[PDB]
Design a protein around this motif. Sequence first.
Motif, short mmCIF file in Angstrom:
data_model
loop_
_atom_site.label_atom_id
_atom_site.label_comp_id
_atom_site.label_asym_id
_atom_site.label_seq_id
_atom_site.Cartn_x
_atom_site.Cartn_y
_atom_site.Cartn_z
N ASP B 149 -33.41 17.07 -5.19
CA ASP B 149 -34.72 17.68 -5.41
C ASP B 149 -34.74 18.52 -6.69
O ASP B 149 -33.71 19.03 -7.12
N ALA B 150 -35.91 18.64 -7.29
CA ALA B 150 -36.09 19.52 -8.44
C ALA B 150 -36.16 20.97 -7.97
O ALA B 150 -35.98 21.90 -8.75
N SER B 226 -38.93 13.89 -6.96
CA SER B 226 -39.05 14.91 -7.99
C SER B 226 -37.71 15.28 -8.62
O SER B 226 -37.67 15.99 -9.63
N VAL B 227 -36.61 14.82 -8.02
CA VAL B 227 -35.29 15.08 -8.58
C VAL B 227 -35.12 14.33 -9.90
O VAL B 227 -34.38 14.77 -10.79
N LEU B 228 -35.82 13.22 -10.02
CA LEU B 228 -35.79 12.41 -11.24
C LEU B 228 -36.69 13.01 -12.30
O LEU B 228 -37.68 13.67 -11.98
N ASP B 248 -28.65 7.95 -13.37
CA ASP B 248 -27.94 9.18 -13.01
C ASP B 248 -27.91 9.36 -11.49
O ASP B 248 -26.86 9.61 -10.91
N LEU B 249 -29.08 9.24 -10.87
CA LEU B 249 -29.20 9.41 -9.43
C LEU B 249 -28.37 8.36 -8.70
O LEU B 249 -27.66 8.68 -7.75
N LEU B 250 -28.45 7.11 -9.16
CA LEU B 250 -27.70 6.01 -8.55
C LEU B 250 -26.20 6.27 -8.58
O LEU B 250 -25.49 5.97 -7.62
N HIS B 251 -25.72 6.84 -9.68
CA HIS B 251 -24.30 7.14 -9.84
C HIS B 251 -23.86 8.29 -8.93
O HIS B 251 -22.78 8.24 -8.34
#
Lengths: 307, 306, 307
Positions: B149-150, B226-228, B248-251
């Motif tokens: 999350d952001a 929203s983290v992206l 980035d998130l996938l990693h």
Amino acid sequence: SHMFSKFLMNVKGVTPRGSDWANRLGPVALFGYGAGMPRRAPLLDFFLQSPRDCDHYAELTIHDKGPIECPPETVMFMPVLNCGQMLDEAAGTETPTSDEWYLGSLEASTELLEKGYVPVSVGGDGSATLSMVEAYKRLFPSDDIVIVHFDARPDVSDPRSPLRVLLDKGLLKGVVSVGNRQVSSEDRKVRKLHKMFYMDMHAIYSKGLFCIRDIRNDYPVFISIDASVLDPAFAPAVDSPVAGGLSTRDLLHIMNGIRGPKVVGIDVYGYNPDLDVYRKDNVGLTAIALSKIIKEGILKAYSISTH
Amino acid sequence: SHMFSKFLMNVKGVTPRGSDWANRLGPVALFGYGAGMPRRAPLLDFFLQSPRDCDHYAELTIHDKGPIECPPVMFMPVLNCGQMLDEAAGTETPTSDEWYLGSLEASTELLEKGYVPVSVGGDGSATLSMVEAYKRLFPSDDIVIVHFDARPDVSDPRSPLRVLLDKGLLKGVVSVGNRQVSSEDRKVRKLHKMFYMDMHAIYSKGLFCIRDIRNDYPVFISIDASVLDPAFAPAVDSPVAGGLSTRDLLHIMNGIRGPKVVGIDVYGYNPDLDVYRKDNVGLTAIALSKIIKEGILKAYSISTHT
Amino acid sequence: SHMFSKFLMNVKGVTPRGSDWANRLGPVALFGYGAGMPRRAPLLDFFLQSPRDCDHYAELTIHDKGPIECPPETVMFMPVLNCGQMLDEAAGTETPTSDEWYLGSLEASTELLEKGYVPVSVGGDGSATLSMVEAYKRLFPSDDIVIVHFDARPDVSDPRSPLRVLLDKGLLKGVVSVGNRQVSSEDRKVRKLHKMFYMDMHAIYSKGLFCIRDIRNDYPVFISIDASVLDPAFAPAVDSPVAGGLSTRDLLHIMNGIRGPKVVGIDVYGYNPDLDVYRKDNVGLTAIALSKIIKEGILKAYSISTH
């Protein structure tokens, strides 16, 4: 096809590579290829109106006709011969068949290569890669060709796919697939069968993208670049987008690492204006990204070395 | 609520996890959750039409009914339970409590039938009802949440994450990608001893240099769009620039460690806030479909190994 | 210009920096600048409605009038004096000239600086960088000034460009260009002639973006940020966009590394609403990105140190 007549006539009217180019790389010839994409293909026009200076301190010079003067060492000029769009609009509403696109592309490439030009094709669906390296293999049967292919997916499971045909016909010394992130079971079989080298997204990301210094190679390289290799945030204008892709900068860096004696040709494709994200002034995001890729791709044809 | 009737009837008619599923991970059950978002919720449909092959060489197989055959082959069966809200069953909009009861009941059914529940869409409230359903069935199990999350999103006492922390149902919480941390957020962080990984810290450390998120307890994966970064997922309320790329998130997701996955919630997506291509495909839909797919893969491959 | 009267009226009516500010950094004053851009300039308003919590656990507090109370040691507040838009949108349909924008900016900057405020300019075409650095140099002639300039272009080949003017008048101790990726031969000449330090995209990317820990400096720094330094995927709303730029997060990280005793001023510019990519709810992507950059820019003005 009569749709390519004006273009093809101008191509074989091109003045050959002068003697002042001897042992120098280039020059580059550029044309618009539109197979499998909407009739309106703005990518070539957008590139021609883009700034001429590159990342590395050189500058494109565009010419609509020869003779192409070879620039001195002190002048960082990179001559490009604009051959314009292959399909002449308002020569009819006819849509050229796949075979007609192939024959038109094959002849233009044969003509350009014979005259000492490095051909760069822009637009279309990737079928130009097939006709371009076959034109090279015709003229230079002894040369070994390796293809560096940027794509979200291997695109070799279909026997009719351009890259698959090249592997099936045994015209390729080797293939380096970069950026794949949608690999099917059949793709894996063709990989092992044709002994393809690959560098998938998840793998190159975790190793560090900037930690890629070069792609070592001693054979003449063809550069085939599907826009789908980029993340949809940078190049949305692709059919069946795959998230988790390369940034435009990521791609530029990997391109700069390409090693080899010469560039046999360049294909930038996969761009469909119907699928793009547009700014309020109706400029497409993917055209911005690819115009840059095309520019630094041209710089590569002039500066590439084995190491 | 009568809006969930058709859905709920099908969920508890689902054939239980076969004996072939052995001591294996999975299988996975998938449903659409629409709480707090517009009635049109296309993410589930968009995911269903997306390609099946993953980053790691495995392949999703989608099924609309049991029995779910345990694959010998790199297949990853997903049981599509469809949307929770039945369109054209009325013009009514389910309340927050109705959404809660619906997801709680569905999750309870799927979990005790051996399925790993995956919720798609909504506003994050599904996270609350899903791990509470797990905690109800598995009182002895310790639960840890990895929350992308952001925002920490724990300043509101009514927050899904805050309620779980106040009821003491969570062993620990790992917040990832926070870049809008309030003074009140920081107090709640220290009080519940939350482990966090803010954007600026993770970035300067090296995003790709994150190898593992070490953990021994069953993990719930809660992912807010929203983290992206807004460049990848613009379809969120109050966007915060400087976030993760989809890659980035996938990693970071791939580095998650644990014995099993208790559930997955992908939310925060509002179609009315997306950037659209000329063909009216939403950018955020594209990014999230991929994250859902690789999230499912995680439930099949997660281990305690660092 | 009568278009700036109401703004300037309020600015020179601002209560001076209180005695409590001691020798503390700040406070910060904020105003909207719209030179060279369309009349409607929504960036300032969008920032003012954005969340006030920063990356580094501090909180902006916005005030429309003084006195600006200096917050205690343990209270992580960062006061901002909102001076609003320079151009009054209801004082006539007249379009201020370049000279009028310059004079208006120079007067506002001078006034704010001698009242103890660090001026932050938002919007416009980058011309504010010229007038703000000149305003500071007028008041403190002995101080040496270094500019950290984020831009896709060097933007010093034109003798009329703000950075070139400042270098020609010899008001600058040094210049650090960051993120350039369209460097011309004329740019290269000005670079070498004025001993400009630069960190081009391809260079800083291949060396590792996150591996940039600091930009060492001992002199008061002006921060000039062109939106074009960011990749078009993050900040599309720029004239002649150049692909392969910085992510917002890349920029935020490089900004954080900037060292110095104080900030003489900040200029965030290059944003044109007519060129932005819009969400369905008509929120511009570049506005989202820049709003964040402005906020973390203000944070730097409160926390910068030579260490």
